[PDB]
mmCIF file of C-alpha atoms and ligand atoms in Angstrom:
data_model
loop_
_atom_site.group_PDB
_atom_site.id
_atom_site.type_symbol
_atom_site.label_atom_id
_atom_site.label_comp_id
_atom_site.label_asym_id
_atom_site.label_seq_id
_atom_site.Cartn_x
_atom_site.Cartn_y
_atom_site.Cartn_z
ATOM 1 C CA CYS A 1 2.978 47.679 -5.129
ATOM 2 C CA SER A 2 1.514 49.891 -7.774
ATOM 3 C CA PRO A 3 4.863 51.010 -9.942
ATOM 4 C CA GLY A 4 3.939 54.940 -11.060
ATOM 5 C CA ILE A 5 3.538 55.750 -7.268
ATOM 6 C CA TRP A 6 6.141 57.867 -5.624
ATOM 7 C CA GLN A 7 6.181 59.914 -2.159
ATOM 8 C CA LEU A 8 7.633 63.275 -1.942
ATOM 9 C CA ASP A 9 8.539 64.907 1.482
ATOM 10 C CA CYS A 10 10.758 67.583 2.562
ATOM 11 C CA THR A 11 13.154 67.298 5.598
ATOM 12 C CA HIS A 12 15.160 70.186 7.164
ATOM 13 C CA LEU A 13 18.718 69.675 8.199
ATOM 14 C CA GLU A 14 21.438 72.333 9.035
ATOM 15 C CA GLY A 15 19.199 75.201 8.195
ATOM 16 C CA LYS A 16 18.460 73.789 4.734
ATOM 17 C CA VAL A 17 15.771 71.834 3.216
ATOM 18 C CA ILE A 18 15.968 68.185 1.649
ATOM 19 C CA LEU A 19 13.527 67.155 -1.121
ATOM 20 C CA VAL A 20 13.198 63.119 -1.023
ATOM 21 C CA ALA A 21 11.036 61.416 -3.354
ATOM 22 C CA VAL A 22 10.749 57.472 -2.588
ATOM 23 C CA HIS A 23 9.392 55.103 -5.306
ATOM 24 C CA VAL A 24 6.943 53.201 -2.884
ATOM 25 C CA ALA A 25 7.087 49.902 -4.362
ATOM 26 C CA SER A 26 11.118 49.557 -4.529
ATOM 27 C CA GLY A 27 11.959 52.174 -1.876
ATOM 28 C CA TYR A 28 14.400 53.643 -4.427
ATOM 29 C CA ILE A 29 15.181 57.296 -3.544
ATOM 30 C CA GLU A 30 15.882 60.672 -5.467
ATOM 31 C CA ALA A 31 17.024 63.594 -3.236
ATOM 32 C CA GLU A 32 17.977 67.169 -3.391
ATOM 33 C CA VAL A 33 18.841 69.942 -0.945
ATOM 34 C CA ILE A 34 16.883 73.051 -2.152
ATOM 35 C CA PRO A 35 17.806 76.435 -0.591
ATOM 36 C CA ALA A 36 13.991 76.934 0.806
ATOM 37 C CA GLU A 37 10.841 75.204 0.405
ATOM 38 C CA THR A 38 9.390 76.939 -2.484
ATOM 39 C CA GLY A 39 6.555 75.925 -4.956
ATOM 40 C CA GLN A 40 9.461 77.084 -7.893
ATOM 41 C CA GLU A 41 11.774 74.240 -6.681
ATOM 42 C CA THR A 42 9.262 71.565 -6.012
ATOM 43 C CA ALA A 43 7.789 72.385 -9.575
ATOM 44 C CA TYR A 44 11.380 71.882 -11.104
ATOM 45 C CA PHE A 45 12.218 68.870 -9.431
ATOM 46 C CA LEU A 46 8.901 67.300 -10.533
ATOM 47 C CA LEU A 47 9.571 67.958 -13.998
ATOM 48 C CA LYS A 48 13.068 66.264 -13.530
ATOM 49 C CA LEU A 49 11.785 63.334 -11.861
ATOM 50 C CA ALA A 50 8.987 62.859 -14.145
ATOM 51 C CA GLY A 51 11.545 62.932 -17.436
ATOM 52 C CA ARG A 52 13.559 60.216 -15.873
ATOM 53 C CA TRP A 53 10.928 57.818 -14.434
ATOM 54 C CA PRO A 54 7.454 56.925 -15.102
ATOM 55 C CA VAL A 55 5.409 59.144 -12.825
ATOM 56 C CA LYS A 56 1.806 58.320 -12.482
ATOM 57 C CA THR A 57 0.700 59.605 -9.001
ATOM 58 C CA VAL A 58 2.738 61.311 -6.039
ATOM 59 C CA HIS A 59 1.929 61.045 -2.518
ATOM 60 C CA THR A 60 3.304 63.020 0.394
ATOM 61 C CA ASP A 61 2.691 63.684 4.299
ATOM 62 C CA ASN A 62 1.745 67.509 3.634
ATOM 63 C CA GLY A 63 -0.656 68.169 0.838
ATOM 64 C CA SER A 64 -0.159 71.770 0.769
ATOM 65 C CA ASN A 65 2.946 71.414 -0.588
ATOM 66 C CA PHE A 66 1.381 70.713 -4.199
ATOM 67 C CA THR A 67 -0.953 73.771 -4.141
ATOM 68 C CA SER A 68 1.074 76.597 -6.015
ATOM 69 C CA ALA A 69 0.479 77.555 -9.466
ATOM 70 C CA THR A 70 4.284 76.114 -10.353
ATOM 71 C CA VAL A 71 3.609 72.889 -8.922
ATOM 72 C CA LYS A 72 -0.035 72.200 -10.382
ATOM 73 C CA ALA A 73 1.766 73.494 -14.002
ATOM 74 C CA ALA A 74 4.380 70.725 -13.642
ATOM 75 C CA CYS A 75 1.694 67.608 -12.643
ATOM 76 C CA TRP A 76 -0.566 69.268 -15.694
ATOM 77 C CA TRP A 77 2.336 68.933 -18.052
ATOM 78 C CA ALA A 78 3.640 65.951 -16.856
ATOM 79 C CA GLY A 79 0.156 64.169 -16.826
ATOM 80 C CA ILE A 80 0.722 63.228 -12.724
ATOM 81 C CA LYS A 81 -2.322 62.894 -10.488
ATOM 82 C CA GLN A 82 -2.024 63.705 -6.845
ATOM 83 C CA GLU A 83 -3.780 61.282 -4.552
ATOM 84 C CA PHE A 84 -5.866 62.972 -1.861
ATOM 85 C CA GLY A 85 -4.313 61.730 1.487
ATOM 86 C CA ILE A 86 -2.897 58.221 1.345
ATOM 87 C CA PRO A 87 -5.193 55.189 0.886
ATOM 88 C CA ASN A 88 -2.343 50.224 1.866
ATOM 89 C CA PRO A 89 -0.997 47.054 3.355
ATOM 90 C CA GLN A 90 2.175 45.993 1.508
ATOM 91 C CA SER A 91 3.775 49.752 1.496
ATOM 92 C CA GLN A 92 2.790 50.493 5.269
ATOM 93 C CA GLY A 93 5.895 52.242 6.774
ATOM 94 C CA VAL A 94 8.061 51.693 3.875
ATOM 95 C CA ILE A 95 8.562 55.827 3.050
ATOM 96 C CA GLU A 96 8.779 56.122 7.018
ATOM 97 C CA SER A 97 11.713 53.438 7.006
ATOM 98 C CA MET A 98 13.375 54.691 3.623
ATOM 99 C CA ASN A 99 13.493 58.151 5.062
ATOM 100 C CA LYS A 100 14.808 56.661 8.664
ATOM 101 C CA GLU A 101 17.810 55.185 6.565
ATOM 102 C CA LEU A 102 18.364 57.923 4.523
ATOM 103 C CA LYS A 103 18.896 59.992 7.403
ATOM 104 C CA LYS A 104 20.908 57.502 9.613
ATOM 105 C CA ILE A 105 23.388 57.283 6.240
ATOM 106 C CA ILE A 106 23.659 61.209 5.932
ATOM 107 C CA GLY A 107 24.931 60.956 9.626
ATOM 108 C CA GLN A 108 27.666 58.396 9.101
ATOM 109 C CA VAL A 109 29.002 60.325 5.842
ATOM 110 C CA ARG A 110 28.165 63.910 6.728
ATOM 111 C CA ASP A 111 32.194 64.626 7.724
ATOM 112 C CA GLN A 112 33.328 63.619 4.711
ATOM 113 C CA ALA A 113 32.098 66.527 2.813
ATOM 114 C CA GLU A 114 31.901 70.482 3.149
ATOM 115 C CA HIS A 115 28.464 70.805 1.683
ATOM 116 C CA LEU A 116 25.217 69.077 3.313
ATOM 117 C CA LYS A 117 24.282 68.427 -0.481
ATOM 118 C CA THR A 118 27.161 66.158 -1.203
ATOM 119 C CA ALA A 119 26.596 64.323 1.947
ATOM 120 C CA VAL A 120 22.925 63.937 0.865
ATOM 121 C CA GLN A 121 24.118 62.727 -2.700
ATOM 122 C CA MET A 122 26.769 60.419 -1.170
ATOM 123 C CA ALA A 123 23.642 59.242 0.885
ATOM 124 C CA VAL A 124 21.474 58.599 -1.917
ATOM 125 C CA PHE A 125 24.042 56.400 -3.634
ATOM 126 C CA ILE A 126 24.541 54.394 -0.874
ATOM 127 C CA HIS A 127 20.862 53.655 0.095
ATOM 128 C CA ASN A 128 20.097 52.950 -3.891
ATOM 129 C CA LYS A 129 22.809 50.557 -4.261
ATOM 130 C CA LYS A 130 22.297 48.441 -0.519
ATOM 131 C CA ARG A 131 22.100 44.921 -0.981
ATOM 132 C CA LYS A 132 19.384 43.654 1.736
ATOM 133 C CA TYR A 133 18.462 42.909 -4.012
ATOM 134 C CA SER A 134 18.989 46.957 -4.297
ATOM 135 C CA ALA A 135 16.413 49.581 -4.145
ATOM 136 C CA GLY A 136 18.389 50.570 -7.788
ATOM 137 C CA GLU A 137 17.945 47.101 -8.809
ATOM 138 C CA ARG A 138 14.178 46.556 -7.801
ATOM 139 C CA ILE A 139 13.002 49.512 -9.628
ATOM 140 C CA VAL A 140 14.454 48.604 -13.105
ATOM 141 C CA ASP A 141 12.925 44.970 -12.538
ATOM 142 C CA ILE A 142 9.389 46.601 -11.854
ATOM 143 C CA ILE A 143 9.878 49.118 -14.781
ATOM 144 C CA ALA A 144 10.892 46.548 -17.315
ATOM 145 C CA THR A 145 8.136 43.911 -16.159
ATOM 146 C CA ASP A 146 6.109 46.719 -18.186
ATOM 147 C CA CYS B 1 26.342 48.926 -26.392
ATOM 148 C CA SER B 2 28.204 48.142 -23.053
ATOM 149 C CA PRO B 3 25.600 49.345 -20.696
ATOM 150 C CA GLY B 4 27.764 51.324 -18.060
ATOM 151 C CA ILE B 5 28.830 53.800 -20.483
ATOM 152 C CA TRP B 6 27.508 57.388 -20.525
ATOM 153 C CA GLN B 7 29.122 60.600 -22.528
ATOM 154 C CA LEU B 8 29.164 63.670 -21.001
ATOM 155 C CA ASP B 9 29.392 67.381 -22.627
ATOM 156 C CA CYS B 10 28.496 70.911 -22.319
ATOM 157 C CA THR B 11 26.791 73.458 -24.597
ATOM 158 C CA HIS B 12 25.930 76.887 -24.241
ATOM 159 C CA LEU B 13 22.746 78.544 -24.933
ATOM 160 C CA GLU B 14 21.642 82.050 -23.888
ATOM 161 C CA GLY B 15 24.991 82.655 -22.157
ATOM 162 C CA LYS B 16 23.911 79.687 -20.157
ATOM 163 C CA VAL B 17 25.708 76.058 -19.741
ATOM 164 C CA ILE B 18 23.602 72.919 -20.393
ATOM 165 C CA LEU B 19 25.215 69.925 -19.186
ATOM 166 C CA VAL B 20 24.022 66.824 -20.947
ATOM 167 C CA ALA B 21 24.367 63.080 -20.350
ATOM 168 C CA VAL B 22 23.899 60.503 -22.689
ATOM 169 C CA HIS B 23 23.489 56.688 -22.100
ATOM 170 C CA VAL B 24 25.184 55.563 -25.342
ATOM 171 C CA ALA B 25 23.879 52.234 -25.635
ATOM 172 C CA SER B 26 19.761 53.905 -25.494
ATOM 173 C CA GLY B 27 20.309 56.954 -26.186
ATOM 174 C CA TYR B 28 18.764 58.191 -22.665
ATOM 175 C CA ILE B 29 19.378 61.589 -21.615
ATOM 176 C CA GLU B 30 20.113 63.415 -18.222
ATOM 177 C CA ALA B 31 20.562 67.143 -18.650
ATOM 178 C CA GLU B 32 20.948 70.377 -15.801
ATOM 179 C CA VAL B 33 21.322 73.652 -16.804
ATOM 180 C CA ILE B 34 24.400 74.927 -14.834
ATOM 181 C CA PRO B 35 25.484 78.791 -14.205
ATOM 182 C CA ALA B 36 28.857 78.281 -15.489
ATOM 183 C CA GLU B 37 31.226 75.207 -16.686
ATOM 184 C CA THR B 38 32.915 74.516 -13.242
ATOM 185 C CA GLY B 39 34.456 71.400 -11.665
ATOM 186 C CA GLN B 40 32.289 71.711 -8.709
ATOM 187 C CA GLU B 41 29.143 71.651 -10.723
ATOM 188 C CA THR B 42 30.431 68.403 -13.028
ATOM 189 C CA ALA B 43 31.368 66.828 -9.919
ATOM 190 C CA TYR B 44 28.169 67.091 -8.187
ATOM 191 C CA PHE B 45 26.366 66.349 -11.525
ATOM 192 C CA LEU B 46 28.347 63.043 -11.786
ATOM 193 C CA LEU B 47 27.807 62.166 -8.098
ATOM 194 C CA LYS B 48 23.871 62.397 -8.386
ATOM 195 C CA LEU B 49 24.054 60.601 -11.959
ATOM 196 C CA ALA B 50 25.960 57.688 -10.519
ATOM 197 C CA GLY B 51 23.438 57.217 -7.419
ATOM 198 C CA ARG B 52 20.582 56.524 -9.912
ATOM 199 C CA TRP B 53 22.073 54.432 -12.666
ATOM 200 C CA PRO B 54 25.441 51.968 -12.625
ATOM 201 C CA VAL B 55 27.624 54.709 -14.166
ATOM 202 C CA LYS B 56 30.974 52.547 -15.204
ATOM 203 C CA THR B 57 32.972 54.745 -17.886
ATOM 204 C CA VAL B 58 32.386 58.362 -18.861
ATOM 205 C CA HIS B 59 33.421 59.372 -22.353
ATOM 206 C CA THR B 60 33.527 63.110 -23.285
ATOM 207 C CA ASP B 61 34.489 65.405 -26.444
ATOM 208 C CA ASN B 62 36.289 67.441 -23.851
ATOM 209 C CA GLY B 63 38.924 65.573 -21.787
ATOM 210 C CA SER B 64 39.757 68.552 -20.000
ATOM 211 C CA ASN B 65 36.756 69.204 -18.132
ATOM 212 C CA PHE B 66 37.298 65.958 -16.166
ATOM 213 C CA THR B 67 40.837 67.148 -14.547
ATOM 214 C CA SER B 68 39.853 69.193 -11.477
ATOM 215 C CA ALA B 69 40.252 67.945 -7.906
ATOM 216 C CA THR B 70 36.457 68.059 -7.558
ATOM 217 C CA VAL B 71 35.639 65.939 -10.269
ATOM 218 C CA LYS B 72 38.596 63.286 -9.492
ATOM 219 C CA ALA B 73 37.317 63.061 -6.255
ATOM 220 C CA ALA B 74 33.712 62.133 -7.472
ATOM 221 C CA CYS B 75 34.790 59.651 -10.068
ATOM 222 C CA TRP B 76 36.942 58.204 -7.468
ATOM 223 C CA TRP B 77 34.192 57.989 -4.692
ATOM 224 C CA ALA B 78 31.811 56.371 -7.044
ATOM 225 C CA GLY B 79 34.157 53.931 -8.660
ATOM 226 C CA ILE B 80 33.988 55.538 -12.274
ATOM 227 C CA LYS B 81 36.798 55.115 -14.891
ATOM 228 C CA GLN B 82 37.281 57.633 -17.495
ATOM 229 C CA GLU B 83 38.093 56.583 -21.112
ATOM 230 C CA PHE B 84 40.962 58.312 -22.823
ATOM 231 C CA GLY B 85 39.452 59.361 -25.737
ATOM 232 C CA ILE B 86 36.771 57.516 -27.206
ATOM 233 C CA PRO B 87 37.629 54.209 -28.889
ATOM 234 C CA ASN B 88 33.068 51.627 -31.625
ATOM 235 C CA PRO B 89 30.971 50.697 -34.842
ATOM 236 C CA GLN B 90 27.217 50.387 -33.494
ATOM 237 C CA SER B 91 27.292 53.904 -31.538
ATOM 238 C CA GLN B 92 28.782 56.146 -34.153
ATOM 239 C CA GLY B 93 27.224 59.336 -33.981
ATOM 240 C CA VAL B 94 24.293 58.212 -31.723
ATOM 241 C CA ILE B 95 25.680 60.787 -28.913
ATOM 242 C CA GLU B 96 26.029 63.727 -31.577
ATOM 243 C CA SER B 97 22.464 62.759 -32.907
ATOM 244 C CA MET B 98 20.844 62.583 -29.494
ATOM 245 C CA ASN B 99 22.593 66.147 -28.694
ATOM 246 C CA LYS B 100 21.117 67.267 -32.468
ATOM 247 C CA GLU B 101 17.620 65.989 -31.532
ATOM 248 C CA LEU B 102 17.718 67.352 -27.861
ATOM 249 C CA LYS B 103 18.464 70.723 -29.324
ATOM 250 C CA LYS B 104 15.848 70.363 -31.944
ATOM 251 C CA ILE B 105 13.390 69.807 -29.046
ATOM 252 C CA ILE B 106 14.544 72.808 -26.676
ATOM 253 C CA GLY B 107 13.576 75.168 -29.625
ATOM 254 C CA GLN B 108 10.276 74.017 -30.250
ATOM 255 C CA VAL B 109 9.096 74.298 -26.427
ATOM 256 C CA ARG B 110 11.206 77.235 -25.510
ATOM 257 C CA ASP B 111 8.681 79.411 -25.804
ATOM 258 C CA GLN B 112 6.127 77.896 -23.317
ATOM 259 C CA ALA B 113 8.697 78.581 -20.249
ATOM 260 C CA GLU B 114 10.392 81.930 -18.971
ATOM 261 C CA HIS B 115 13.530 79.614 -18.163
ATOM 262 C CA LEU B 116 15.723 77.966 -20.349
ATOM 263 C CA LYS B 117 16.212 75.275 -17.841
ATOM 264 C CA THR B 118 12.462 74.451 -17.678
ATOM 265 C CA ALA B 119 12.663 74.230 -21.464
ATOM 266 C CA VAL B 120 15.616 71.638 -21.074
ATOM 267 C CA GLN B 121 13.932 69.477 -18.779
ATOM 268 C CA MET B 122 10.680 69.473 -20.878
ATOM 269 C CA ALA B 123 12.982 68.862 -23.723
ATOM 270 C CA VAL B 124 14.757 65.816 -21.741
ATOM 271 C CA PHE B 125 10.917 64.253 -21.157
ATOM 272 C CA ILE B 126 9.971 64.817 -24.362
ATOM 273 C CA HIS B 127 13.198 62.653 -25.626
ATOM 274 C CA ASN B 128 13.478 59.799 -23.222
ATOM 275 C CA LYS B 129 9.468 59.020 -23.609
ATOM 276 C CA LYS B 130 9.618 59.269 -27.579
ATOM 277 C CA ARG B 131 8.534 56.266 -29.622
ATOM 278 C CA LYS B 132 10.442 55.887 -32.597
ATOM 279 C CA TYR B 133 10.462 51.866 -28.001
ATOM 280 C CA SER B 134 11.521 54.987 -26.369
ATOM 281 C CA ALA B 135 14.930 55.589 -24.893
ATOM 282 C CA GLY B 136 13.208 55.444 -21.396
ATOM 283 C CA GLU B 137 12.193 52.429 -22.013
ATOM 284 C CA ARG B 138 15.540 50.997 -23.780
ATOM 285 C CA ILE B 139 17.679 52.070 -20.784
ATOM 286 C CA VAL B 140 15.924 49.937 -18.257
ATOM 287 C CA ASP B 141 15.600 46.722 -20.425
ATOM 288 C CA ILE B 142 19.320 47.047 -20.988
ATOM 289 C CA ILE B 143 20.083 47.322 -17.305
ATOM 290 C CA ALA B 144 17.322 44.653 -16.360
ATOM 291 C CA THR B 145 19.045 42.172 -18.621
ATOM 292 C CA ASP B 146 21.599 42.500 -15.793
HETATM 293 C C1 TQX C 201 8.659 80.637 -13.808
HETATM 294 C C2 TQX C 201 7.676 79.959 -13.921
HETATM 295 N N1 TQX C 201 6.216 80.620 -13.191
HETATM 296 C C3 TQX C 201 5.317 79.770 -13.281
HETATM 297 C C4 TQX C 201 4.186 80.662 -12.858
HETATM 298 C C5 TQX C 201 2.894 79.917 -13.046
HETATM 299 C C6 TQX C 201 2.570 78.663 -13.209
HETATM 300 C C7 TQX C 201 3.775 77.989 -13.953
HETATM 301 C C8 TQX C 201 5.096 78.446 -14.083
HETATM 302 C C9 TQX C 201 6.185 77.912 -14.459
HETATM 303 C C10 TQX C 201 6.115 76.734 -15.005
HETATM 304 C C11 TQX C 201 6.064 75.459 -14.259
HETATM 305 C C12 TQX C 201 6.212 74.198 -14.733
HETATM 306 F F1 TQX C 201 6.195 73.219 -13.869
HETATM 307 C C13 TQX C 201 5.938 74.098 -15.982
HETATM 308 C C14 TQX C 201 5.993 75.171 -16.538
HETATM 309 C C15 TQX C 201 5.759 76.395 -16.210
HETATM 310 C C16 TQX C 201 5.739 77.708 -17.362
HETATM 311 C C17 TQX C 201 5.836 74.865 -18.458
HETATM 312 C C18 TQX C 201 6.142 73.441 -18.881
HETATM 313 C C19 TQX C 201 5.554 72.316 -17.840
HETATM 314 O O1 TQX C 201 5.790 72.812 -16.449
HETATM 315 C C20 TQX C 201 7.436 78.758 -14.240
HETATM 316 C C21 TQX C 201 8.896 77.894 -14.777
HETATM 317 O O2 TQX C 201 9.578 77.895 -13.901
HETATM 318 C C22 TQX C 201 10.015 76.830 -13.157
HETATM 319 C C23 TQX C 201 11.186 76.915 -12.637
HETATM 320 C C24 TQX C 201 9.124 77.454 -11.828
HETATM 321 C C25 TQX C 201 9.823 75.482 -13.681
HETATM 322 C C26 TQX C 201 8.892 78.880 -16.123
HETATM 323 O O3 TQX C 201 10.271 78.294 -16.362
HETATM 324 O O4 TQX C 201 8.378 79.365 -16.831
HETATM 325 C C1 TQX C 202 33.480 71.536 -1.788
HETATM 326 C C2 TQX C 202 34.415 70.657 -2.380
HETATM 327 N N1 TQX C 202 35.268 70.603 -2.541
HETATM 328 C C3 TQX C 202 36.567 69.596 -2.792
HETATM 329 C C4 TQX C 202 37.896 70.072 -3.041
HETATM 330 C C5 TQX C 202 38.647 69.044 -3.426
HETATM 331 C C6 TQX C 202 38.065 67.877 -4.015
HETATM 332 C C7 TQX C 202 37.196 67.439 -3.663
HETATM 333 C C8 TQX C 202 36.144 68.438 -3.349
HETATM 334 C C9 TQX C 202 34.869 68.191 -3.081
HETATM 335 C C10 TQX C 202 33.888 66.793 -3.017
HETATM 336 C C11 TQX C 202 33.667 66.551 -4.448
HETATM 337 C C12 TQX C 202 33.251 65.109 -4.499
HETATM 338 F F1 TQX C 202 32.722 64.931 -5.855
HETATM 339 C C13 TQX C 202 33.021 64.217 -3.418
HETATM 340 C C14 TQX C 202 33.707 64.715 -2.153
HETATM 341 C C15 TQX C 202 34.108 65.973 -2.047
HETATM 342 C C16 TQX C 202 34.883 66.060 -0.892
HETATM 343 C C17 TQX C 202 33.450 63.728 -1.497
HETATM 344 C C18 TQX C 202 32.525 62.595 -1.493
HETATM 345 C C19 TQX C 202 32.593 62.070 -2.853
HETATM 346 O O1 TQX C 202 32.534 63.071 -3.933
HETATM 347 C C20 TQX C 202 33.537 69.051 -2.610
HETATM 348 C C21 TQX C 202 32.213 68.710 -2.292
HETATM 349 O O2 TQX C 202 31.605 69.583 -2.828
HETATM 350 C C22 TQX C 202 31.280 69.683 -4.310
HETATM 351 C C23 TQX C 202 29.789 70.545 -4.497
HETATM 352 C C24 TQX C 202 32.006 70.057 -5.115
HETATM 353 C C25 TQX C 202 30.586 68.144 -4.446
HETATM 354 C C26 TQX C 202 31.915 69.042 -0.729
HETATM 355 O O3 TQX C 202 30.748 69.062 -0.465
HETATM 356 O O4 TQX C 202 33.167 68.790 0.136
#
């Protein structure tokens, strides 16, 4: 429910790494394909994310991915705190479910592009605008309510 | 004023290319440093932008940058129309002014990072949260008003 909360996790597909951020309260996704998991790439993703949306707290299923000096620098600069583990009723399985839907969609569109990263961005677009209201609409509502 | 309208322009700094998208009605920026101006890079930027915000129409000060097959494909897929030239009273000089502020800020923070792209993302963050209300707050309000 809390509106500044995002969960970041990486997945591998086709020998490449997909960084996925889910805005927990709405299910809205931002994702990028990165060459390999690196503190550098995560730091840079975080700086971009935080410049676009109000990021207060980051959750993850892999805490170690946020321990490098580059990533600490990013959270420090952007004023982001990282929760220890994951403390919640209403959001149970949301992030899991969103990551499950994103992958299903990537599968459906994969054939329409040469590059995995193109397919990822198509899937992100599809997911954010999907009317069950859309994640895209839900996140704006939450942030606007102020 | 119209809420689906973004202007995209490239600038060069340090022998590198900065792609800047300004949401005209609010002054909110998304920017990335790309290796060189290429249809490929623009197409990919557009696909990401449109997956995150409702992009109806793109304006530019360089129409030729939107003529490649890659970029046509992106606008076609995302349902984006491109205005011929630029038709407006209330937005006069906004995009010019926003690009002027972004560059001033890049200058102030450039020394705090090795990489230009890091400096760019710092400047984007600063610009979007700057309270005159912020661009970041204005864009959510506009999109939410529906
Ligand atoms: C190359 C680099 N190396 C670092 C080494 C140790 C600690 C931080 C950084 C950072 C870094 C990371 C950040 F997240 C960050 C800042 C720095 C210096 C300062 C402003 C706010 O956020 C960068 C950074 O490049 C990256 C590609 C890793 C972002 C740099 O360009 O200097
Ligand atoms: C490598 C590539 N080459 C192309 C050549 C001609 C026309 C389109 C593309 C596209 C493209 C561009 C798009 F914008 C796009 C689509 C394609 C195929 C299909 C879905 C919606 O948008 C890609 C694309 O890679 C880029 C890095 C340029 C995005 C690809 O991965 O195939």
